Design a binder for this molecule. Structure first.
Ligand code: MS8
Length: 255
């Protein structure tokens, strides 16, 4: 009857600080898609838990020494029983940790101002006037860093160049950069949808350049590993995941 440690990260509208004049403590301090998800899992599988924000505020990437950081690291060193956040399922990650069936699908795309002639990653990679980058130490950064596709290698050379600092610490910083300067942020599509519907001067440029999903993470060889995936299929089957997405993404839109 262990009380599980859940590693996660701040990211709208997956995990956010609950607004209240009543100083909150514990898991009550947070709310969002992922917390509703963790709550469902908690009830479907009957387990206790304590939400812990990843110390370094990173999603997780492997440096030069093959050393991991972020939530991925927290799982590897068994400092967390599971990770419940917008954690991207990737091949390189599956080498060191486990992922449940996906609870949400998405893909890398481009967030930029509207009304410009830019229409694709190619239009971005061929030029240098418009600055562009991604969140440091995330699956999108490594996608470009390790790509063998000519276009993306050229983009990585630009966003990682010494001439400048094209990468951003987190999504907020990236978004602010797009709104105040001539910058395009390569970001995952479900967040681009969220951001553009709340910033009508912004838009997605082109379509998704890859296709993947978010899954619950657990240390390889975890006893919960199978139950988690079962509960996910149940939530998906019952239309529950769809309801949760709609609940947190609902808004006035752009007209
Ligand atoms: N899902 C990524 C993190 C991130 C990315 O590297 O694209 C950063 C953050 O960017 C905004 C959308 C949610 C997050 O995606 C990951 O699991 O590493």
């Amino acid at each position: 009857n262990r009380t599980l440690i859940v590693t996660t990260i701040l990211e709208e509208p997956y995990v956010m600080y609950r607004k209240s004049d009543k100083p909150l403590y514990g898991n009550d301090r947070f709310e969002g898609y992922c917390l509703d998800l963790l709550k469902e899992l908690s009830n479907i599988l009957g387990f206790l838990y304590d939400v812990k924000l990843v110390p370094d505020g990173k999603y997780g990437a492997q440096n030069d020494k093959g050393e991991w950081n972020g939530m991925v690291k927290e799982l590897i060193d068994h400092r967390a029983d599971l990770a419940v956040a917008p954690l991207t399922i990737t091949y390189v990650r599956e080498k060191v940790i486990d992922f449940s069936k996906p609870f949400m699908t998405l893909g890398i795309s481009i967030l930029y101002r509207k009304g410009t002639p830019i229409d694709s990653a190619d239009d971005l990679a061929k030029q240098t006037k418009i600055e562009y980058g991604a969140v440091r130490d995330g699956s999108t950064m490594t996608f470009f860093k390790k790509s063998k596709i000519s276009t993306y290698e050229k983009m990585w050379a630009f966003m990682s160049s010494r001439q400048q600092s094209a990468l951003v610490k987190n999504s907020d910083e990236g978004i602010q950069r797009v709104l105040t300067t001539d910058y395009a942020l390569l970001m995952e599509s479900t967040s681009i949808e969220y951001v553009t519907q709340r910033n009508c001067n912004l838009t997605q440029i082109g379509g998704l350049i890859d296709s993947k999903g978010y899954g619950v993470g657990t240390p390889i060889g975890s006893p919960y590993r199978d139950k988690i995936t079962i509960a996910i299929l149940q939530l998906q089957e019952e239309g529950k995941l769809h309801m949760m997405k709609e609940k947190w993404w609902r808004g006035n839109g752009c007209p």
